[PDB]
Amino acid sequence: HPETLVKVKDAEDQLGARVGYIELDLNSGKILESFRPEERFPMMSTFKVLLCGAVLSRVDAGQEQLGRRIHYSQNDLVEYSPVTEKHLTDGMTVRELCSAAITMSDNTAANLLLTTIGGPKELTAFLHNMGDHVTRLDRWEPELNEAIPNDERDTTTPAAMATTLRKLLTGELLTLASRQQLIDWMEADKVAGPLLRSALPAGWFIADKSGAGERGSRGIIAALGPDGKPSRIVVIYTTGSQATMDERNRQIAEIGASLIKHW
Ligand SMILES: CO/N=C(\C(=O)NCB(O)O)c1csc(N)n1
Ligand SMILES: [K+]
Ligand SMILES: [K+]
Numbered sequence: 001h002p003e004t005l006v007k008v009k010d011a012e013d014q015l016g017a018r019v020g021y022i023e024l025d026l027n028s029g030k031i032l033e034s035f036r037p038e039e040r041f042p043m044m045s046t047f048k049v050l051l052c053g054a055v056l057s058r059v060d061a062g063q064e065q066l067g068r069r070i071h072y073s074q075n076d077l078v079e080y081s082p083v084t085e086k087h088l089t090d091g092m093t094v095r096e097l098c099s100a101a102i103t104m105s106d107n108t109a110a111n112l113l114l115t116t117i118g119g120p121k122e123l124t125a126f127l128h129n130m131g132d133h134v135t136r137l138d139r140w141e142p143e144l145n146e147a148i149p150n151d152e153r154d155t156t157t158p159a160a161m162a163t164t165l166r167k168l169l170t171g172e173l174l175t176l177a178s179r180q181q182l183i184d185w186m187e188a189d190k191v192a193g194p195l196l197r198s199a200l201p202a203g204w205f206i207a208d209k210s211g212a213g214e215r216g217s218r219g220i221i222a223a224l225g226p227d228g229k230p231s232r233i234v235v236i237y238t239t240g241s242q243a244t245m246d247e248r249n250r251q252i253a254e255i256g257a258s259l260i261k262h263w
Contacts, residue, residue: 001262041237044211145213216241
């Protein structure tokens with residue numbers, strides 16, 4: 001609805017920085033509304049959904065098992081690893097790592113999972129092979145969050161991300177069982193409360209993944225809709241603001257409130 005664009009472009013103003021937005025019909029793939037849809041933004045932790053999509057594609061092909069245990073050391077821990085720092089002794093399964101990476105945004109979990117698929121180059125190859133010729137992962141945690149101005153490393157566009165997410169959640173890319181597992185991890189997101197979830201009406205479904213990075217970067221990807229089932233995808237990114245995290249969060253929550261109001 002154009003009223004939501006009032007709020008998006010208000011955000012870009014308030015934040016002193018670019019905001020990218022797209023609202024996509026889940027069933028049809030129709031772009032309902034957009035802003036800067038084909039400009040690049042750092043993915044930050046939103047890539048972790050793509051990562052676990054690639055992992056689940058390998059499970060479906062018999063190249064990985066969700067119950068396989070990976071053992072790691074203090075040597076693997078990177079900043080912001082609230083789950084993996086607790087399991088150094090006995091390790092974690094692939095399933096557990098994807099849960100951690102998505103619900104808790106655990107960074108070591110993401111690095112361990114990247115290692116399983118052959119690293120950033122292979123995630124990018126996986127994306128290109130599914131028709132996403134835009135999104136690229138180049139680095140590991142933590143450096144992939146550096147958000148250097150005009151750098152295309154570790155970036156997506158709102159449009160590329162939204163259509164990739166649609167394909168993962170609804171397409172023949174993944175078996176039904178694997179698509180639902182991915183959804184389930186995203187529904188279980190624990191570290192996105194101040195964002196779209198704070199605008200979500202009772203009874204609505206949301207499956208999301210947030211991101212934060214350097215230089216004011218912030219974003220979210222989500223599938224959401226009324227009566228317990230998703231019907232649209234929303235992608236919001238920003239980078240470059242000097243605003244506080246609370247300020248960034250509130251702008252995203254307010255974009256959410258508007259898109260809900262005008263659904
Ligand atoms: C909780 O972390 N803050 C992060 C981070 O590593 N986020 C991972 B994901 O985008 O949710 C961070 C990285 S650079 C920065 N400033 N904050
Ligand atoms: K429109
Ligand atoms: K160990």
